[PDB]
Design a protein around this ligand. Structure first.
Ligand SMILES: *C(=O)/C=C\c1ccc(O)cc1
Length: 125
């Protein structure tokens, strides 16, 4: 259980040191996306919430393949804008409802410290 609070101001610095195994000890859902939306990391808390098997979604496109419910200006559009601008820090509520019971969550999207990588953090509300 890695002690990092959701929405922490310096979360990108703290998560810079975690490998896939340490990511699995977070109290919340954590997805790392590349600039095109491909999933690079996907932790255990996130699979708990979504029912996805983390090893099976690495490599897949989040917006096209795994989470089409996020393919809308309200989620993907903010993502695309941040990638385009090279800056991203936003939090909002969303409902996850593809192939699963509709689940309301808090989403925090933030640019990683490292290269062209972007974090998506999720927790139940
Ligand atoms: C909408 O599609 C939100 C996200 C999401 C992620 C994974 C799975 O399996 C369903 C939905």
């Amino acid at each position: 259980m890695e002690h990092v609070a959701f929405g922490s101001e310096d979360i990108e610095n703290t998560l810079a040191k975690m490998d896939d195994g340490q990511l699995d000890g977070l109290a919340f859902g954590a997805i790392q996306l590349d600039g095109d939306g491909n999933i690079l990391q996907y932790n255990a808390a996130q699979g708990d919430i979504t029912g996805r098997d983390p090893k099976q979604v690495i490599g897949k496109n989040f917006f096209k393949d795994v989470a089409p419910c996020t393919d809308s200006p309200e989620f993907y559009g903010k993502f695309k804008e941040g990638v385009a601008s090279g800056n991203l820090n936003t939090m909002f509520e969303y409902t996850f409802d593809y192939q699963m019971t509709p689940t309301k969550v808090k989403v925090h999207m933030k640019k990683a410290l490292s290269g062209d990588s972007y974090w998506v953090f999720v927790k139940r509300v």
